Design a protein around this ligand. Structure first.
Ligand SMILES: [Zn+2]
Ligand SMILES: [Zn+2]
Ligand SMILES: [Zn+2]
Ligand SMILES: [Zn+2]
Ligand SMILES: [Zn+2]
Lengths: 151, 280, 237
């Protein structure tokens, strides 16, 4: 509690010399660079491109992207359901063991699929799906660390 | 105040849903006021659900599963405007579909079924009077809004399970009867809030701008500003006593001794809901 | 028509920190940026009004209501009197802002509130800060906000519920150029211009015991009080 009593002291003496208005409010250099900031070519990267490029015309890749939705989505609904029920039974433990290898098998069957599709142009974003399997990856790590803490 | 509600809405699809004395189709006037009913339901009830079942030709089919999506119900009612509506409905089959998946809700809720019924005849392959002994056991509160007459089994169904039964005068009476069902009658769930535009916090499942539950991990995703509007009833603010210069508008509370005016005393208690001197 | 209430963050602990940081941007080089935007709002129309509120610690003084030479000499002398509990309070200043708009709306007008927040957010007033947003949303009062260094999570929800703008400035001494660009036009002229869109919303809640920012928690089913990772029983009633 040493810097509060002096910063409150330093702001009291500052408020005697006051109100310059003509040149002390803005400069010609900084205000001109701000025009480049709010221009459509400045810090407006969402303004320059509104629609995602999707590595081709979005007809054939979005078919595979919809197939990549069902391939990861309907497998993760079996993963999170058994992870939800803690149970502490052997049947849920063996199911967690059975889902462990398949989730690992879901990685290489999607990484190679992202190595085949995104090698023609490598233009689209494919890592947006990858954190959903990465969330399936580290949830097995923290449960094994919790089961080691439980036992 | 009110509690959670899992309200099914049963819609008739009989031959008599092509009748006049409404908007020129009797079904499309029901579906018009129901889309208003779903919107008004989710605003006075933050974390509730709605299912919609239809009945047609001695059978019931679940049009929408029991989920708290305030958009997926309206885009399905707009799809079923051109339903063929052949045959007579059933009331044993509809209250069996709305019981096989309403029995498994937790006990701290208020499970309900609202039957909008236009036909007079419920041709059903079993006895109704053992469902009403079963619905009374499962604490389900069945209320019926009837059309054009008063069936005897719809009064036994309403008054034994615990609901109401009313008959339509006109379309203005039909909108007034549905607005009595949006108010709730007087356990800890696990939701996950939705920071980052609208993402999922449990499994990073990005989807659209909805308060719907997660389709993958099964967690309800609500918006925390929606729950914030239903505060200020609990620990509410008290009134003031009155006997120039003000504190709110700058031109009398008994908690912090702050003088108000007449234009501020009407604004703090009604719309602001918090004393501006008490926050300091 | 077009009443504009400015709520400046006059936190004397944060502003004294930058006064000794030698970042070349003090309070006196910021209130005059409010004074120019205060003066520039009184030029775009004949019948335009102004009100400036300063957020001190444990106090919140009105500045301007106690031609522009009598409208700037009041705000100068009031900062000279107010600046002479280590977190600022903001919801007490927006509560006086909605009280002043409601009185001036009785003597007739579309109004808006511009918050220039400087310090970090205080989560201990979230139950009161969310009440004054829905009280402003029911009267179509925009709550615009510009922030200096850190993204206030409470203030981003104020601009999306009401319908205002949220803009993080990257540079301190170019504050006036942002203020004259995105906050000088009113609600009707806002539809005809290009403004930076909102980039992120910080939607969380607070526990009823710890008031920590939670992303996954437990709500009650009848009290709607969101709780932390305990869930034994409903604590309130
Ligand atoms: Zn999820
Ligand atoms: Zn007053
Ligand atoms: Zn008070
Ligand atoms: Zn409760
Ligand atoms: Zn907590």
């Amino acid at each position: 509690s040493q810097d509060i009593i002096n910063s409150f002291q330093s702001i009291r003496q500052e408020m005697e010399a006051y109100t310059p208005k003509l040149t002390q409010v803005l400069s010609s250099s900084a205000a001109s660079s701000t025009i480049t900031a709010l221009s459509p070519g400045g810090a407006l990267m969402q303004g320059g491109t509104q629609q995602a490029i999707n590595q081709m015309v979005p007809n054939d890749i979005q078919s595979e992207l919809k197939h990549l939705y069902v391939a990861v989505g309907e497998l993760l609904r079996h993963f999170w359901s058994c992870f939800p029920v803690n149970t502490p039974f052997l049947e849920e433990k063996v199911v967690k063991m059975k889902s462990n290898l398949e989730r690992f098998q879901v990685t290489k069957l999607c990484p190679f699929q992202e190595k085949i599709r995104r090698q023609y142009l490598s233009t689209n974003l494919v890592s947006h799906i990858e954190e959903m399997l990465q969330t399936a990856y580290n949830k097995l790590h923290t449960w094994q660390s919790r089961r080691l803490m439980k036992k | 105040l009110g509690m959670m509600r899992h309200l099914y809405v049963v819609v008739d699809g009989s031959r008599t849903m092509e009748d006049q004395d409404l908007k020129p189709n009797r079904l499309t006037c029901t579906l018009k006021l129901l889309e208003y009913f779903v919107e008004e339901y989710f605003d006075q009830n933050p974390i509730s659900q709605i299912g919609i079942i239809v009945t047609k030709s001695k059978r019931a089919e679940k049009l929408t599963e029991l989920s708290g999506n305030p958009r997926k119900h309206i885009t399905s009612l707009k799809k079923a405007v051109d339903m063929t509506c052949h045959g007579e409905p059933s009331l044993y089959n509809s209250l069996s579909i709305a019981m096989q998946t309403l029995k498994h809700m937790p006990g701290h809720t208020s499970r309900e079924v609202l039957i909008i019924f236009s036909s007079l005849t419920t041709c059903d392959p079993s006895n109704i009077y053992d469902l009403i002994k079963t619905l009374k056991a499962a604490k389900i509160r069945v209320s019926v809004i009837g059309l054009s007459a008063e069936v005897r089994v719809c009064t036994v169904l309403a008054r034994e399970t615990g609901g109401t039964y009313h008959v339509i005068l006109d379309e203005s009476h039909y909108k007034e009867l549905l607005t009595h069902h949006v108010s709730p009658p007087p356990g800890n769930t696990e939701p996950g809030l939705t920071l980052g535009g609208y993402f999922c916090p449990q499994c990073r499942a990005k989807y659209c701008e909805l308060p719907v539950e997660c389709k993958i991990c099964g967690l309800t995703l609500v918006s925390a500003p929606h729950l914030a509007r239903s505060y200020h009833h609990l620990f509410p603010l008290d009134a003031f006593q009155e006997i120039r210069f003000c504190y709110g508008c700058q031109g009398v509370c008994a908690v912090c001794q702050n003088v108000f005016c007449v234009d501020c005393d009407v604004f703090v208690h009604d719309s602001l809901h918090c004393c501006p001197g008490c926050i300091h | 028509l077009n009443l504009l209430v400015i709520v400046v963050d006059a936190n004397p602990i944060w502003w004294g920190k930058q006064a000794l940081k030698e970042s070349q941007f003090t309070l006196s080089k910021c209130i005059d940026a409010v004074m120019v935007l205060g003066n520039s709002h009184l030029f775009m129309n004949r019948s335009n009004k102004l009100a400036v509120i300063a957020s001190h610690i444990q106090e919140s003084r009105f500045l301007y209501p106690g031609l522009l030479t009598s409208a700037n000499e009041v705000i100068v002398e009031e900062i000279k009197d107010l600046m002479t509990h280590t977190e600022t309070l903001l919801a007490g200043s927006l509560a006086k802002a909605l009280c002043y708009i409601h009185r001036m709306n009785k003597e007739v007008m579309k109004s808006r509130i511009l918050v220039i927040k400087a310090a970090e957010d205080s989560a201990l007033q979230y139950m009161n800060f969310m009440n004054v947003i829905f009280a402003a949303q029911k009267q179509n009062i925009l709550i615009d906000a510009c922030v200096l260094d850190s993204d206030s999570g409470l203030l981003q929800q104020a601009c999306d519920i009401t319908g205002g703008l949220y803009l993080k400035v990257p540079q301190m001494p170019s504050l006036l150029q942002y203020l004259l660009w995105v906050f000088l036009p009113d609600q009707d002229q806002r539809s005809q211009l290009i403004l930076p869109p909102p980039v992120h919303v910080d939607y969380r809640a607070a526990c009823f015991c710890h008031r920590n920012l939670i992303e996954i928690g437990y709500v009650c089913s009848v009290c709607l009080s969101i709780f932390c990772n305990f869930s034994p029983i409903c604590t309130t009633c």
